[PDB]
Design a protein around this ligand. Structure first.
Ligand code: NA
Ligand code: NA
Ligand code: NA
Ligand code: NA
Ligand code: NA
Ligand code: NA
Ligand code: NA
Ligand code: NA
Ligand code: NA
Ligand SMILES: [Zn+2]
Ligand SMILES: [Zn+2]
Ligand SMILES: [Zn+2]
Lengths: 234, 234, 234
């Protein structure tokens, strides 16, 4: 899997690598396409909203490695709103969203489930991060079914109910995304533990987004992204 | 033009490169002298004032590339004051100043013009950044005339009324400075678009500061900077 | 001395290098073990507490260089408390502590002395940073005696009453730690000025922690640190 979809830079002080560190490590590890997905601005220890707006200036391909502009947005409420403005959406390619205590504290199972499903149904998000987090109890099957319906991927997070999520996605028919949730570039692309979970449930390789740069880019285009010419050859 | 005078680091989250990234890219692109000019502390998403005071510890020359310590200060008011303290001036070599909405909102043409001219006449600034910004209407000729009188350069900004500024400087007799306004090191030294504007007005190469490291350093010394020995050989 | 124990990253905007910059410079300068010791969270221009908690994810050895997870904590009061929580202690290997005006303003000699000695006697700190700072008058002999008793090293800081501190430690029988207090990686391991102070007092090399990675690691283990297997070969 030459694609990693979830990692963080020094824009949060609880991460320690820069854009150039991720490019260099990708080069070393055979990763051909990666996304930087810094924490959304409503989070603690998070960057300013301009951090995301100004990603529009980034080079697309450096040293043969493609770079997606992303966000790990924060689910704000039971209506499925996230901390990403219209100007921010305009600059970004990949929208991940998830639960973080400073923004959305863990609540009753139904509150968590409704918020997650409303985020999925909003049409604004591509991947829900760490849905297996035991801190946020959810109706996994209902979430997987909604994710399949709205073509939203559920993440299996290497940084980490994950077998239950994987099996639920398998049966619901949706996509899985693998993400290292790296906070240094040293763990980019490392999915060993994710893969064991997927194997414990005989997850179909055909529904793993990270199989190839083209599979992932095709998914984003199906969700409405204008094609990125600079990524043709990936 | 082996000199670039305007770029930003991770000290603002809307920039993404470090000092070491700029050194490495300079090395790759044949840039022999560059200035880091982070946003002044009154700006949103800007670093602490100590970020500028502590630039006094930087090496002067790394891998053959000279490093100027700078600031893109913010014009604060119609008296021409900027967000740079005496201790900060003491640590810095290059003072750029300009209009940014969070500090000085766009106002009537006369308010903008008076503030810009007062900044020029203060004697504390070397370059006015993006004077051609249509968001801040100014009397371009009056600004160019004041800039020539006080030996302040007007910037032609590649990141970007620019032809009008260039022609005004040509006739007023002042200097132009080229700046990439890079927020990643990938665009360091890239002035293609600046050069087209200058060519559309047959701007005299003799009044472009970036022609050589020595021309730029001679300008700073004429404005009062003690000579930097470590830069002799540039 | 292939060990440097005190340096800072971009997590403070008054520092300019990243973890990867320090690894690369260590490699270049023959440093085999270094500690990142960013300013504690109560300081101005300092990172969030999560910056220290999440250091638990760092690789231990990169390109042959070992990496200690540290903090330059701030002495908070005359009871010897510092701005380091239990969760933070759990993630860190090296605890440095010192006086910084925004947290603990310079006061009477007895106030400064009591706070420093209480920090030493707390058992939570390994090194007291810049005890020779003339801004904070202390009873040097009393501090050195307490440091020897509680097996706390006093720093001789290259960034910088230092001869008096060195002679006091010599006679009290404690350890000295050398630290560059680097705010860029370009000065990592540079102790020339520290060594002159130590030579002016014929300081015994046997009580300089930085002599070898193993001497330093043995000291941390004697203070209660579980052994770091990944550092066996250093
Ligand atoms: Na978009
Ligand atoms: Na997360
Ligand atoms: Na994350
Ligand atoms: Na100056
Ligand atoms: Na600007
Ligand atoms: Na700028
Ligand atoms: Na510890
Ligand atoms: Na200090
Ligand atoms: Na320090
Ligand atoms: Zn995080
Ligand atoms: Zn900017
Ligand atoms: Zn500092």
């Amino acid at each position: 899997y030459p694609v990693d979809l979830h990692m963080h830079t020094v824009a949060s002080t609880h991460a320690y690598s820069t854009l150039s560190d991720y490019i260099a490590q990708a080069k070393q590890k055979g990763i051909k396409l990666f996304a930087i997905t810094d924490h959304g601005p409503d989070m603690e220890d998070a960057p300013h909203h301009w951090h995301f707006i100004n990603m529009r200036i980034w080079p697309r391909v450096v040293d043969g490695v493609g770079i997606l502009r992303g966000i790990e947005a924060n689910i704000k409420n039971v209506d499925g709103e996230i901390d990403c403005s219209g100007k921010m959406f305009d600059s970004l390619d990949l929208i991940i969203a998830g639960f973080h205590e400073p923004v959305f504290a863990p609540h009753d199972k139904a509150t968590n489930t409704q918020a997650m499903i409303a985020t999925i149904a909003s049409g604004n998000v591509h991947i829900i991060s760490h849905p297996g987090n035991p801190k946020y109890e959810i109706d996994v099957k209902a979430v997987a079914e909604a994710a399949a319906k709205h073509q939203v991927a559920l993440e299996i997070n290497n940084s980490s109910n994950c077998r239950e999520v994987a099996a639920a996605v398998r049966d619901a028919g949706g996509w899985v995304a693998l993400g290292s949730d790296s906070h240094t570039a040293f763990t980019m692309g490392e999915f060993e533990e994710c893969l064991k979970i997927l194997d414990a449930v005989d997850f179909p390789p055909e529904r793993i987004l990270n199989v190839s740069p083209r599979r992932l880019l095709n998914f984003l285009e199906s969700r409405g992204m204008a094609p990125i010419a600079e990524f043709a050859d990936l």
